[PDB]
Symmetry: D2
Subunit: 75 residues, 4 copies
């Protein structure tokens, strides 16, 4: 649950499924500039150079974020 | 120019003014959970626990992000 | 992505692929520390102080986590 | 005070003075590859491309680190 996408309808950041988070995070860690994934009948590209997810069918843009863990870690 | 808010009308992340970026970043660094700033008389609150900016005149919620620079630096 | 500083050489040093994966798996899991071995020596990484501890001698060497830029560059 | 330097004598990361932290952090945020500061009777260079600080009088090297705050912030 390290990646999130923003929902403008509700005004909240939302989690991805475990499998879609893994697909996104694997591409992030591999140095890719973008990644494609599917959810049901929906098709998306996450653009890491802009931190935006684009619906491939409609062009709708949803912002994305990467959660960050504190360094150093707290006790 | 390290903080950004997402403009849903244009579909792009946007920088704050130098003054507003400083107000936000100083609150971030001091451990505050939120911060108020203005653009002229227009009032906003950034909520750091949700990474959302609340327009205190329209109520619209826009996501925010903190840009992160690479560690170590290149070159 | 994890590095330890070698004061003998004056440089940050990478871990082996397996030790990097062990450390990073504990980091991502939210643990406060992680055990590994290097060269028949036992070590603990303490994430709350960002140091590696030699379990035999007590010697502390600093560690660091490299960070990727957000957003990514084109 | 977000920057730290490692003290091998005590085995701990240590904070900078407010002013020296500010000098370092301003160069960091400005995109510079290194920065010099003076503390006491010594000049030091922080090399951001290696995350190492060099004492320019003696040549002694100490590792540095940049603390990171959690995103999003906890309540
Ligand atoms: N309630 C909702 N309203 C509108 N749109 C939604 C949505 N809930 C998810 N979406 C869209 O869907 C993407 C993947 O969201 P995600 O949770 O990974 O989707 P699924 O559970 O179907 O995953 P999977 O079964 O592995 O394909 C997400 O960015 C968002 F764009
Ligand atoms: N106790 C100590 N032992 C060994 N070395 C030390 C040290 N204390 C500071 N150093 C050296 O000096 C640098 C700046 O350390 P810093 O605290 O910003 O400098 P000042 O002393 O001017 O601070 P202040 O007393 O608060 O005004 C620091 O990286 C390190 F290299
Ligand atoms: Cl949006
Ligand atoms: Cl969509
Ligand atoms: Cl020194
Ligand atoms: Na040295």
């Amino acid at each position: 649950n390290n990646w999130r996408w923003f929902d403008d309808r509700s005004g909240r950041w939302c989690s991805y499924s475990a499998s879609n988070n893994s697909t996104i995070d694997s591409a992030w860690k591999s140095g890719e500039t973008s990644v494609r994934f599917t959810a049901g009948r929906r098709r998306y590209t996450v653009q890491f150079t802009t931190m935006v997810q684009v619906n491939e069918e409609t062009g709708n843009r949803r912002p994305v974020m990467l959660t960050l863990l504190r360094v150093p870690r707290l006790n």
